[PDB]
Amino acid sequence: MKLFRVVKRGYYISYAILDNSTIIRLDEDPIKALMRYSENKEVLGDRVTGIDYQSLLKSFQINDIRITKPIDPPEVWGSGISYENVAKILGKTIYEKVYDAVRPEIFFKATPNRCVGHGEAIAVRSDSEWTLPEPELAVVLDSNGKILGYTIMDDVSARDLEAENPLYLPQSKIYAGCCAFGPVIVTSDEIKNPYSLDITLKIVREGRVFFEGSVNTNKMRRKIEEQIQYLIRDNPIPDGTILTTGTAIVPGRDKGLKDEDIVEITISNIGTLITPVKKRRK
Amino acid sequence: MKLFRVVKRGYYISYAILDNSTIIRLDEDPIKALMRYSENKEVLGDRVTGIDYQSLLKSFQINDIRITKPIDPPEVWGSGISYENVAKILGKTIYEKVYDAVRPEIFFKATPNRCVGHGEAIAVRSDSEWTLPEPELAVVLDSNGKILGYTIMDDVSARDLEAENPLYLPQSKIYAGCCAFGPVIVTSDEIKNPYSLDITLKIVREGRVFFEGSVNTNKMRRKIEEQIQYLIRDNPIPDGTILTTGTAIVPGRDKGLKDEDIVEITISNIGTLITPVKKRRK
Amino acid sequence: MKLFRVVKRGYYISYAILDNSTIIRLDEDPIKALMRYSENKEVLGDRVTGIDYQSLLKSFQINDIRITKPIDPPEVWGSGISYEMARERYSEENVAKILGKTIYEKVYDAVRPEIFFKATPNRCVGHGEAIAVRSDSEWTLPEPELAVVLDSNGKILGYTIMDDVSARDLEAENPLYLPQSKIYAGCCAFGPVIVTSDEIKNPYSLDITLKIVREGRVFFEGSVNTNKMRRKIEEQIQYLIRDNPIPDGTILTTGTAIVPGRDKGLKDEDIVEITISNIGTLITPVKKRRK
Amino acid sequence: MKLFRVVKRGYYISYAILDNSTIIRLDEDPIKALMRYSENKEVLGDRVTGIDYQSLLKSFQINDIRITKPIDPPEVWGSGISYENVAKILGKTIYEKVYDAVRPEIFFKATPNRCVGHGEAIAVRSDSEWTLPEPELAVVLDSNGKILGYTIMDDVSARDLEAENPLYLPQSKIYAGCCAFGPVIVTSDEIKNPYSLDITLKIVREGRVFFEGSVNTNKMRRKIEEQIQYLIRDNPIPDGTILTTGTAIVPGRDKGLKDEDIVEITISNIGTLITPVKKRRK
Ligand SMILES: [Mg+2]
Ligand SMILES: [Mg+2]
Ligand SMILES: [Mg+2]
Ligand SMILES: [Mg+2]
């Protein structure tokens, strides 16, 4: 099952697309629906015609419906350095200490209102000359840490603020339009091997590909199960929480995002998340 | 107006105690009341008798009511290094860089469910051998950054985890029972000079005063308005958001909290917050 | 548009079958949707498939969905003695009367018609759900009637079939027992759908048919056309709403003409089918109440 | 306990005044509170001061609080002829048939929105030339028929219509402002004998007593418990349903209500209900 959400006349509607391309309108809140699917693979709803899923992915708005975040995730967290100048402890840089350490990096990323979806604009802080989109795979957790599904997440980060001081990391991570995900949430059974997925980032600037990298999730060293273990340790999380797993694609200092740029991220079996950029004014 | 809340048989009731020992029971949600009082110093409610506010401060529970968090703050943030081995950037340590730098340390600290109050227990993480209570003055804010009131907050920190790597700061700060505040929220008018208050931390182990030490808020070199300025830059905060301003009282390596302790924090014009300590186990 | 409603896992879903047999699932409260449609003929919702409406009519239930009252009408009122009936010259020596003329035939000629309160939503049942005979009635009859769904201004939002189940023996004993005879658990039934106003060009040209079935055998049958109605619906509404504000989705049942005999009283296990032209067939089993 | 309700700034607040003058503000819905009191006589709430109950009875609106119906009864039913030209069955009149018969008159009277309270206007229908107030005792019921308390009720009746035809009875009983009750609901224990109570009806036209009359509830022949039995027979009623038990006081043909009149009704241990009279236009 792949789960998406639109806004129609000011209220939300959740739809599910099945492998046979039949679309179902959910009777339930989508978080509770993912929890139900997790138990018995059942979607409560009715089969609907006239929902143009493909046009929503390509055009965002069709008829009176516009695609958005697939859910409101009460909390969003992130893990850093899960894949293969700055501060440092005893010569060893703090980032490469984490890469070897038993304890991984876990940080708070967003609340639902700080997030955006397919077609909606991510944001660059007003006080940032070097903001980068971090293309990552993310998971939707229940309160026990069980994976309910996967989605594409964009951990937008003001890399210059982090670089100045690791104590600025929250400021570099947590702000309006600092997080994007979708276009859908795929249920767990849609992904057989999470550690064999391609992730392609593209940054379009004036109809022209300013950057393009990609990496497979087989390059991931820190396992997702372990990231969750540390997240929920003495730390109750609400159902529908999202954990973003980390990025490998990191454009250079000179590849900072700017107003009007289009960030396109593609992950295998999930889809392609497209978002414009909005530079904030002081 | 000094504002507190109780829990009675599964529901909350908010009371505002006024300059004169006359207690008023609120018609409104307590966060909204603070916004109204900030506007015109009006309070909606009936003058109540038979509410032993002083017995609640000492005993926590009287009859069928018990004191708790005065409000549910949708968000809690913190600001470190506001008053006068570890990592470093070009020799100079990360902490003493933030002190000198124009930008302060702002970090996400808590959500309502992770917060506790007078009489309720704060938590030491299962995997922390050195966790300290950081006594601080905290401000309740509206979404514009207007100081709706002051309170005593305990920013409970797993200092060992912080010391290992600054990137473990979120994990050291954000967990169940990592944050306590109360026993009241005082309105802006109750405090003439916020930089003229006596913060005192006491820790009681087995009836004996295991630690003591106080400081005045005149020693605070980072001004709260600056902290609020950076907190909200490009960062929409909800009404009732709490910003804890930083600590000056820092016990040593041998003075780490453990099960059954009693952490008492006093601030001038606000009162004394008392929370027993609870150790989490693996 | 014809409006129906199902229950599914303890919650309601409303559906609107359009004229080209396309089924739409309402995003709105059905009463809200009736009012919308009344203004501009629009229905908010997605076209759906797999909703086997014709099966819900015949079988009542399919998998986890079951048909019920098409709406919760906040109030239900009725208007008796609205059809043509000849001055039958020997009034039963027992009906209440005023200066010799029976109360029922005084209403017949009066300017003021009979208007009475019939039910709340929780006293109403739908297609496939059981109507009741009171535990203390030995002559309860179904009264097949055309009913209209009203807004607060008295505007007709649509029509449906209504069964005004009446403990006629209690009404016979004393007209002051009328409320006890009309108002009780399962005393009222409507559906299977609410058809919008435009689905009925002439409301005074519909065939109403009643069938009572006992153990497969057809116990009673009769019919009547609404061209026989004398007390017109516009008048019934005028008197209903006079100094008496009604909520949106109120239903006014407009009276019956099919009256089974004294020997044809309802009893347990019976089935009651009512058919009206352009609306459908309402079917309800009967339940006798135990003391 | 004696239970009343005000409207303050658009919302409702219910208060309980105990015999010893002490006024309690309720935590629960008043209907639920009455069911709790019926159980074990426990009342959840706080004692309050500054609520002048006696002045509210006399002034209706004090400052920004205004007394109204003590509860919203989901249903109101009536019962005629419980005490000592027209239609008739076998020469004998329909009313005295009911008086003797084992089955009493039970009829539906009002929905909550058709009811009014102390200080609010009852109505005379536009098409009625002889409307009389019927002062009656009334009981508040739970769904099992158990009496939760007593109150004054005015069954405002368009008598000319009832006279023309008893099939017009519902039109004479059910319309906007056809019912009034309060100012309080007294709990069951506040009345030791309901069959020994003085009911008094004053009507005030242009300064003067236009009608006065009274009668005790010892003249009531139809017992209340019987009326409740027939009400709930095969006929479930919601919690908070009111049953009014018929009137003994009946003014004559000349004493029909009209615009600007005032209706006072008094019953021992309950209080006095006052309502202006509005005549509807065409
Ligand atoms: Mg990252
Ligand atoms: Mg701190
Ligand atoms: Mg009828
Ligand atoms: Mg009466």
Side-chain angles (χ1 to χ4, degrees), chain A residues 79-80 107 134 136 155 173 246-247:
Chain A
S79 185
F107 61 92
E134 298 186 357
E136 316 187 356
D155 180 0
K173 293 284 185 178
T247 198

Side-chain angles (χ1 to χ4, degrees), chain B residues 134 136 155 173:
Chain B
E134 299 181 5
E136 312 187 355
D155 179 2
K173 291 285 179 176

Side-chain angles (χ1 to χ4, degrees), chain B residues 60-81:
Chain B
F60 316 124
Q61 194 169 54
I62 304 294
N63 299 111
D64 54 0
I65 59 175
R66 180 182 58 77
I67 197 167
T68 176
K69 295 176 287 191
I71 64 166
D72 288 321
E75 301 183 9
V76 181
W77 294 69
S79 200
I81 320 159

Side-chain angles (χ1 to χ4, degrees), chain B residues 122 131-136 152-156 159 197-204 209-216 247-252 255-257 261-268 271-275 277:
Chain B
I122 49 161
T131 292
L132 291 177
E134 299 181 5
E136 312 187 355
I152 303 157
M153 177 158 286
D154 186 351
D155 179 2
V156 188
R159 294 295 313 288
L197 306 170
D198 291 329
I199 301 163
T200 302
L201 165 61
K202 295 167 69 167
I203 311 173
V204 181
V209 180
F210 181 55
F211 175 91
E212 190 159 322
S214 77
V215 66
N216 193 285
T247 189
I249 301 155
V250 181
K255 304 313 196 99
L257 267 30
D261 288 359
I262 314 291
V263 179
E264 308 177 347
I265 301 165
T266 300
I267 292 184
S268 311
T272 297
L273 179 63
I274 301 173
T275 60
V277 179

Side-chain angles (χ1 to χ4, degrees), chain A:
Chain A
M1 186 189 78
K2 324 204 168 195
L3 185 46
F4 67 104
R5 196 177 59 170
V6 306
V7 40
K8 188 191 195 180
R9 297 170 60 96
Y11 54 93
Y12 286 123
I13 307 185
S14 277
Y15 297 97
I17 175 160
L18 278 30
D19 292 309
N20 44 37
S21 289
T22 74
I23 300 169
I24 290 160
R25 161 158 171 151
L26 306 210
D27 294 338
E28 298 192 302
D29 164 84
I31 291 166
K32 182 54 183 157
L34 288 163
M35 291 183 70
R36 177 178 293 276
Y37 192 90
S38 138
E39 183 184 344
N40 73 337
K41 292 176 172 180
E42 188 184 7
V43 202
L44 290 180
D46 292 322
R47 185 182 193 282
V48 289
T49 65
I51 306 297
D52 200 337
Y53 174 55
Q54 293 298 330
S55 298
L56 282 169
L57 296 169
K58 299 170 193 178
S59 316
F60 316 130
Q61 163 75 61
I62 301 291
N63 291 97
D64 40 7
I65 57 178
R66 194 188 56 76
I67 197 166
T68 185
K69 286 181 302 208
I71 63 169
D72 292 314
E75 303 179 6
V76 182
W77 298 72
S79 185
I81 321 146
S82 49
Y83 283 87
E84 300 271 50
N85 63 145
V86 304
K88 50 220 297 184
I89 299 171
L90 281 303
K92 203 167 174 185
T93 177
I94 55 166
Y95 299 114
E96 82 200 2
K97 266 222 170 185
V98 170
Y99 179 57
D100 299 334
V102 302
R103 183 184 303 284
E105 184 184 7
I106 299 289
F107 61 92
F108 187 78
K109 171 59 186 178
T111 57
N113 65 294
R114 298 196 175 85
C115 296
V116 300
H118 191 49
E120 299 166 5
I122 54 161
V124 178
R125 290 180 64 91
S126 67
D127 52 347
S128 185
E129 264 68 56
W130 179 41
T131 285
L132 287 185
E134 298 186 357
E136 316 187 356
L137 176 70
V139 283
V140 182
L141 278 28
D142 77 357
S143 58
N144 292 319
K146 173 168 186 173
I147 296 176
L148 300 174
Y150 300 79
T151 188
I152 308 178
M153 182 156 287
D154 190 337
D155 180 0
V156 192
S157 317
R159 295 293 318 287
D160 51 327
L161 310 196
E162 180 177 8
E164 277 188 45
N165 205 317
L167 298 171
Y168 298 147
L169 188 64
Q171 295 182 63
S172 79
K173 293 284 185 178
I174 305 161
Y175 62 91
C178 74
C179 185
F181 67 94
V184 306
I185 285 162
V186 305
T187 41
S188 198
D189 60 353
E190 294 280 7
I191 300 186
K192 300 292 163 61
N193 186 7
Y195 302 108
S196 178
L197 302 164
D198 289 304
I199 303 177
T200 314
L201 174 62
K202 284 167 65 168
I203 304 173
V204 182
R205 188 176 295 178
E206 293 149 296
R208 160 272 205 288
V209 176
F210 178 72
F211 179 98
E212 176 161 16
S214 54
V215 66
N216 196 285
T217 48
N218 60 36
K219 299 288 132 58
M220 200 178 290
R221 302 296 131 213
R222 192 74 65 164
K223 69 198 300 181
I224 292 166
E225 176 193 28
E226 197 205 342
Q227 293 186 336
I228 296 165
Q229 183 196 155
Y230 281 94
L231 171 58
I232 72 180
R233 181 170 295 168
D234 294 313
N235 190 45
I237 56 164
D239 293 328
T241 294
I242 292 179
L243 174 54
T244 195
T245 67
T247 198
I249 306 159
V250 178
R253 270 253 41 200
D254 70 324
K255 304 293 184 66
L257 256 40
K258 65 179 69 165
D259 198 55
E260 304 278 30
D261 289 355
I262 312 301
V263 179
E264 308 189 322
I265 310 175
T266 303
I267 300 190
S268 310
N269 307 310
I270 303 175
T272 303
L273 178 63
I274 301 173
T275 61
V277 175
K278 167 55 183 174
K279 175 63 174 178
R280 298 295 190 203
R281 183 178 137 72
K282 297 179 178 200

